[PDB]
Design a protein around this nucleic acid. Structure first.
Ligand code: ZN
Length: 463
RNA sequence: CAGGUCUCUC
RNA sequence: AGAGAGACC
């Protein structure tokens, strides 16, 4: 992706979008009980921790575009992924506006506890003023999509979250490109049934792990991904996507049966306008982060990328022997013979993608089940039942999370969630985590799950 | 102060 | 149906 132009809001006739300025994070009661390095990301031009210009750092993620139209490798990739999707028989029909707003069994309702985006945000109209879970009326909604249309700008906010020390100094805070309620509705009407299919089928037919539960999905993964594993990291995947990958997505959608009017919505994803504070700007390429289907489309595009990288980099690849799952930019894949990701990464740069080793070292060392990570978690066979696989969140990540809070009223739930993650690293680490928690007054007041109970409940998931 | 998935609590 | 937390693009 690449910023094509920047204009003042006076010039564009767009109203201003000023997000919050101060972090809601504070040191928790456990801040000094565990070691950690992360702090709240920079949210403001004049944060004293900054060491470069803040806004230059913010938009530096748009590294530019390379290919704009598919080559033979990307077209064979899109078609191969498309035919694979056909076995799911996705309903390419339009979803009812009622179901698109209020949800089905496999589609969650529009989040009514959150902003309605441009222009409703600036005019003080909240989602709850238009939609209502009880009446399920779409009448007010239909009026406002006719009042305001589609293809409305994304509102930009800086994301309030923990970041490493190095990303705070270099102003590398993340951004939220918030969609307008009208566009989430129309995207949900167009692709709602595809979202349903994807949510219900995490695995290697969708090629997507959206909807997976790591507690149970991890045991399936070595079976779904036989043979030699490959994986790597992307730098700023979403923002690095050139328009070729949105063209490629258009071919996948067409081949699985989508009408031309449905497929036309992709150009409105590839070419988007955004308002940050007092300025409008155009972005060509790049997936918007706050869009309906961001996770699924990023995941679908990743299935195209991996396939096209394979057949362009190496001779004699049979794409039918590829197995992979993606959760947006995160990928774990398998092929019957090892795949050299140093060569994949070189082909990647030509497609405008920056790919680095999985182990965060400089060398593309071997990925196997003892060091693979997915959604930040490792794979650890159970000592008693070696076919059941524990997802292992590193204790370093759990330490980082526990040291801070946005609302100390929910300390207990926060700690409980971290204990549901931590015990997979084994009894020794878990009791050492619990003891460290119990070492401060609030820690002695929390209902902490007992290790044996966590293990019992997990075993019972498999019966 | 966005789009989602997952899990937990009366 | 109401409330939270974890991880994600
Ligand atoms: Zn434009």
């Amino acid at each position: 992706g690449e910023i094509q132009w920047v204009k003042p809001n006076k010039e564009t006739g767009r109203l201003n979008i000023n997000g919050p300025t101060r972090t809601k994070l504070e040191p928790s009661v456990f801040h000094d009980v565990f070691e950690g390095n992360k702090e709240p990301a920079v949210l403001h031009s004049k944060d004293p921790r900054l060491e470069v210009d803040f806004e230059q750092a913010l938009f530096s993620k748009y590294v530019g575009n390379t290919l704009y139209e598919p080559d033979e490798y990307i077209k064979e990739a899109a078609l191969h992924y498309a035919n694979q999707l056909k076995q799911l028989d996705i309903d390419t029909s339009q979803m009812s506006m009622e179901e698109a707003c209020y949800g089905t069994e496999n589609l969650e309702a529009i989040d009514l506890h959150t902003s309605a985006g441009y222009p409703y945000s600036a005019l003080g109209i909240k989602k709850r003023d238009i939609l209502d879970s009880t009446t399920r009326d779409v009448s007010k909604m239909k009026f406002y999509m006719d009042k305001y249309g589609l293809d409305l700008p994304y509102s930009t906010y800086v994301k309030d979250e923990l970041r490493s020390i190095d990303k705070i100094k270099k102003g590398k805070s993340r951004l939220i490109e918030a969609s307008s309620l009208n566009d989430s509705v129309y995207l949900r009407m167009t692709f709602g049934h595809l979202y349903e299919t994807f949510h219900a089928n995490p695995g290697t037919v969708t090629g997507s792990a959206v909807g997976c539960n790591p507690d149970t999905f991890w045991s399936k993964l070595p079976i779904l991904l036989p043979g030699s594993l490959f994986a790597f990291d992307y730098s700023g995947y979403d923002a690095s996507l050139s328009p070729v990958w949105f063209r490629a997505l258009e071919l996948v959608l067409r081949e699985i049966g989508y009408s031309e009017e449905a497929v036309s919505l992709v150009e409105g994803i590839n070419h988007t306008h955004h308002v940050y504070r007092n300025k409008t700007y155009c972005v060509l390429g790049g997936m918007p982060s706050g869009m309906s289907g961001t996770s699924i489309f990023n995941s679908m595009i990743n299935n195209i990328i991996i396939r096209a990288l394979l057949i362009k980099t190496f001779k004699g690849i049979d794409l039918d022997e590829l197995n992979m799952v993606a959760y947006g930019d995160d990928v774990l894949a398998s092929y019957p013979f090892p795949i050299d990701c140093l060569e994949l990464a070189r082909t990647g740069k030509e497609y405008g993608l920056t790919m680095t080793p999985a182990d965060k070292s400089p060398c593309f060392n071997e990925v196997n089940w003892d060091n693979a990570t997915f959604l930040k978690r490792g794979f650890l066979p159970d000592e008693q039942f070696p076919f059941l696989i524990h997802p292992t969140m590193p204790m370093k990540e759990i330490h980082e999370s526990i040291r801070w809070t946005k609302d100390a009223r929910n300390t207990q739930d926060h700690v409980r969630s971290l204990c549901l993650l931590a015990w997979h690293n084994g009894k020794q680490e878990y009791e050492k985590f619990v003891s460290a928690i119990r070492s401060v007054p609030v820690g002695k007041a929390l209902a902490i799950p007992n290790y044996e109970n966590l293990r019992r409940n997990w075993l019972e998931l498999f019966h």
